[model samples]
Target: HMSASCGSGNFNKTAAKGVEFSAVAGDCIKYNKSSGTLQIGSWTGVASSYNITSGPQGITNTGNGWTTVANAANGDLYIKIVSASRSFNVKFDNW
Candidate 1:
């Protein structure tokens, strides 16, 4: 089980079953189509913020939140943060 919280503080794992998950502010959890879980929170640690100020592909900021990049052929997904400094913690399961 992999758990992460943004900004700082600590996060405890709850029950989750799905491909993609997103957590924003407090313990906000959401489900996505990808096969992973993401948890974000605001605390006192390190703040790593990124803004995709500009980009081609006519893909601009959605203003919704984060941007997802996927490998069309392989169906692999990744995230890009447009900033110099960002803080966060990540733990992989069965690593």
Candidate 2:
């Protein structure tokens, strides 16, 4: 299990694997690539950035600060956050 703390916050278990899901603020959002369903959290306020595009072309920043790379190959999953004083966690499992 990977863990991280933001500010004076504490670590929490976000997911247990099997299905891919993302937590925004305190709500859990599941990603269904097959259905092309993308849901943003309400607490996220305004999106700082987002993207959905093809691979090798890299991601370009849009005016809304959102970009995505679609049809990306497997093993191309990564996450990054721009904050000097923020923390987060991620976990991977194979059963």
Candidate 3:
């Protein structure tokens, strides 16, 4: 796919088991094993091939806080990762 850098660590992408969408309650993306490498990119509205660079690629983590990556207004947002660890936790969130 077009995931340029995986955001630094061994980044991975996990779709929230749905199509395009907007922010919602419990809108969260789980990626990095530590929940520290998740990045929020702008949504592209439609579900296009990953080869297209019209969306976010190789995004870096935001130190602003762990909450920003969640409920990001991105219409087709993604959950990114930066580690090869296990999931320490999981919530009722879509992802």
Candidate 4:
């Protein structure tokens, strides 16, 4: 199974299916999706309500928050939650 890291307090990365996390309005999960498209599979927030604000190649949300980061010069992708503070889940995949 493919897994990614979550940024927060002491939360650890999950390797089973997807990573479950609690995030504030501005909390973000950082990972590398430098070759293809990225998707958020188990998100609890409103669809398409986040942003990839890592660097100059920042991108806004589209679809159900799946993003195409194939051409992003910065290998680091920051998945920022833009809603109210709550518990949520997220999974990273290249497609």
Compared with the true structure, the alpha-carbon lDDT of candidate 3 equals 0.29
Ranking by lDDT: 4, 3, 2, 1
TM per model?
0.22, 0.24, 0.24, 0.49
TM-score, prediction 3? 0.24
Candidate 4 residue pairs in backbone clash:
none
Winner on TM-score (1 vs 4): 4
lDDT of 4 by residue, 39-86 (tens): 555446444345555432334433244544454433555565555435
**Superposed model 4: Cα runs more than 4 Å off:** 1-20, 43-48, 54-74
Question: All models: lDDT?
Answer: 0.26, 0.28, 0.29, 0.47
- How close is each model in CA RMSD to the real structure? 12.4, 10.5, 13.8, 7.7
In TM-score terms, candidate 2 sits at: 0.24
Worst 10 residues of 4 by lDDT: 1-10
Task: List model 3 lDDT by residue over 58-91, tens digit each.
Answer: 3332222222233233244434333212222221
Instruction: Please tell me which predicted candidate would have the highest TM-score against the true structure.
Output: 4
- TM-score of structure candidate 4: 0.49
Candidate 2 local Cα displacement, residue 89, angstroms? 13
